[PDB]
Structures are given as C-alpha cells and as structure tokens.
Amino acid sequence: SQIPRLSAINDLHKIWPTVEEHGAAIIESFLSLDIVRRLNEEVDPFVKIEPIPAAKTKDHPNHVLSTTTRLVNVLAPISKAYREDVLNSKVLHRICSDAFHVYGDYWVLMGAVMELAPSNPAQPLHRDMRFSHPIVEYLKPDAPATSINFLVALSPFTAENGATHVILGSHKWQNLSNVSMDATVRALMNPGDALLITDSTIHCGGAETTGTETRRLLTITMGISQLTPLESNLAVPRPVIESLTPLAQRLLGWASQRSAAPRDIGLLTIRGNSIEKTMNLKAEQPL
Ligand SMILES: CN1C(=O)c2ccccc2NC(=O)[C@H]1Cc1ccccc1
Numbered sequence: 001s002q003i004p005r006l007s008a009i010n011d012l013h014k015i016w017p018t019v020e021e022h023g024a025a026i027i028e029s030f031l032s033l034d035i036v037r038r039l040n041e042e043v044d045p046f047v048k049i050e051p052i053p054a055a056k057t058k059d060h061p062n063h064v065l066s067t068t069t070r071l072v073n074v075l076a077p078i079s080k081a082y083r084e085d086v087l088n089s090k091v092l093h094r095i096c097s098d099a100f101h102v103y104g105d106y107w108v109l110m111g112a113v114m115e116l117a118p119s120n121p122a123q124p125l126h127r128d129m130r131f132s133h134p135i136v137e138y139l140k141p142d143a144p145a146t147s148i149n150f151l152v153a154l155s156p157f158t159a160e161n162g163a164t165h166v167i168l169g170s171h172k173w174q175n176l177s178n179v180s181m182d183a184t185v186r187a188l189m190n191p192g193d194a195l196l197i198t199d200s201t202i203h204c205g206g207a208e209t210t211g212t213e214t215r216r217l218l219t220i221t222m223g224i225s226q227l228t229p230l231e232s233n234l235a236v237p238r239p240v241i242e243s244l245t246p247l248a249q250r251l252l253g254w255a256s257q258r259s260a261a262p263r264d265i266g267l268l269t270i271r272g273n274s275i276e277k278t279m280n281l282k283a284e285q286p287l
C-alpha cells in the first residue's frame, strides 16, 4: 500500500486532506524544474563547504544526523529562488493554511538543503521535532499537527539511492510496537516533487546503495507561529529582508504573527503594533 501521489495544481485541494488521513503524500511538480535548477546552483557552494553536522567548530552541533549528511539552513541570504519562488509558493501556502487554520499563522520552522554522500546509511525511523521541541510530545494524541515537513527532491529519489521511507498511518499510532522497516513504503520522486508529512509521521532517509549517487533535498518544516523556529533569520541583512514579499517576511520572523483565537492579541507585537509597522519595514524593494 503506497504513498498517494497528487498533482500540485489539479489536485491542490486534496493534498492536505490526504496527508491528514494517510500521514504522507507526494506532490508531483511541487517546484518547477527551473526553480530546482536555480536552488541547486545557488546553494551548491554552501553545501560543499558545510562540515559534518556535529563539527567541533559549531556551538550548536547536530549529533543526530550522520557524518555523511550535510545540512544547510538559513537559505534566504543564499538563494533568490528560495526567498522569492519557494517562500511565495502558492501550493505551499494553500496546504499550510489548510493544515494550520485551527491554530492561526504559520511560518518556516526550518528551510534546509540536505545532501547525502554516496553510501549514506538509512536514518533511524523517527518523528521530527523531538530534538528541538519536547513540548510536542505532551500534546494530546489527536491534537491537530503543529508542523509539517515538505521534503522536496532536488535530485532523483530512487529505492537504490536512498529515497525516504514513510509508514502510512503512523501519524495516528500511539503504540510503537508496530514500528520497523517492514511497515514502510518509499517516496519515489523526480526533482521538484515533494514528500509531505506531518510532525507525527514516522519516516527515515533511506540507505544509499549505489555507492555513487549524491542525493539532495529541500526540507521545509512549516509550523504554527506559536512554535519557535529551529533556525534564525535575525542576521539576514535588512536589504535582503526588504526585497521580499510581506508574506515571505512574516514566514522568516520579520513580521508579527496571529493566532486563530477570535480575540487574538497576537504574537511578537510591540505595544499593540506590529514589527513591520513599528520598524517601517519595506517590502518587495529590489536590490
Ligand atoms: C535531528 N533531526 C534533524 O536534524 C532534522 C533535519 C531536517 C529536517 C528536520 C529535522 N528534525 C528532526 O527532528 C530530526 C530528524 C532525525 C534525523 C535522524 C535521526 C532521528 C531524527
């Protein structure tokens, strides 16, 4: 029983309901091949100079990822394609406003390119967020998902090169005795396709068995604005921020945020006024 594959345009309204039901879905052509090309070109060197996740020079080493994983986040200052095309993706936002309407505004918890070296082993089956947001474990099991993860293929995902594994329905599992690779299916994707899961979906990167291919993805963890992002844009240069749309600015923490509470008093406000209003933050200004 395989992962449901949906069209990004034809099937748009069906994507989140599918994920909310089965815990994963494949969005075909989530990003056009042109945007994939530009993303790749724009991140390439930063991937090449990224060290091992737990590198001794980092003051927040990542000990969980394998030393053959490279992860580069805070993509806005690196990539025009990301901060213009990806952050304003209309598919991304209809899915996110579908999934999060119960909670209110959403933003990027983390936008990151992961490239896995040849023969990178499968990851352990996991739920995301358990090394950053322990509060999530304390949610009632039927609480609506507070973050979701777009795993976007920047190169081909094949069974042989390590395409991600998911366990269908595992986002509703409380008893974990059922957990094992036996229960998984694969996300077979062309570049630009995206695998979409929730923070409860049990999944892992697969084993790279060709010993040659280098697999690369863009993982966009979108979450309610009530949860703190894994990454900071505080250091992104103001001229970059002001080149963006207001929507993009909000997604990066450069705007105030709102809950869905009918009388919402808002998040990250300043004496009752927004960040952008207070700071007179320009938008969509070219560089
Ligand atoms: C540790 N870890 C990340 O680094 C990560 C990377 C990209 C996007 C999300 C993300 N979030 C996480 O919670 C996890 C995923 C994980 C990976 C291997 C083993 C166990 C868990």
Ligand SMILES: O=C(O)CCC(=O)C(=O)O
Pocket (backbone or CB within 6 Å): 114, 123, 128, 151, 162, 163, 164, 165, 203, 204, 205, 206, 217
């Ligand atoms: O490598 C993959 O395909 C998935 C990686 C993943 O799920 C994670 O890093 O949390």
Ligand SMILES: [Fe+3]
Pocket (backbone or CB within 6 Å): 126, 127, 128, 203, 204
């Ligand atoms: Fe993961």
